[PDB]
Amino acid sequence: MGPGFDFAQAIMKKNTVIARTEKGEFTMLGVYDRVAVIPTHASVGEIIYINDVETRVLDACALRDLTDTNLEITIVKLDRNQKFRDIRHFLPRCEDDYNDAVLSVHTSKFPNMYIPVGQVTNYGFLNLGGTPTHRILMYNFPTRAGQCGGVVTTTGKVIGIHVGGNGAQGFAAMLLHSYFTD
Fold this sequence. Notes:
Strands 1-2-3-6-5-4 form a 6-stranded antiparallel barrel. By secondary structure, it is mainly β. The protein has one helix spanning 3-15, and strands at 16-21, 24-32, 35-39, 47-50, 53-64, 70-78, 98-105, 113-128, 131-139, 151-154, 157-165, 170-174. It folds into 2 domains: 1-15 and 85-182, no CATH class; 16-84, no CATH class. The chain is built from 1 helix and 12 strands. The longest helix has 13 residues, at 3-15. It is classed as viral protein. The assembly is monomeric. The protein is Protease 3C. The EC number is 3.4.22.28.
């Protein structure tokens, strides 16, 4: 509808796939080459389904900060025959707050879904499903089951992936440039 959804749509149309684990279907953001991200609660194994294709997982790494606290980001490397558009230049370098954000989801159940979630706060610490978690972004939208892995964007930046909510608020794990240095 506007420049926010334009940027969001540009990421979704080239840099997402539908990831299916034993824990269900997830929006999965492809970052560069064969490297993608997914919430750690997806419990990625040796085999994953990517747009319903059986795919070997060449590596999977659940990120923690240096305090050894959960970040809820799993970085996956896929035995796929195609590379993602390199979008690492859209990733913030530092933790920050953001004014106008869109949350974008693409699953079987929720195709082509875009949510104007508004202002994004650098929340920091969250007890997420009982797990102490760092580097959390908070927006005031009643987000629901099926939205985890959802990509949080502002015009010009990919700032996080949706990892949970409490019925009033949604929460995203920050994406930072330094996660995807090669």
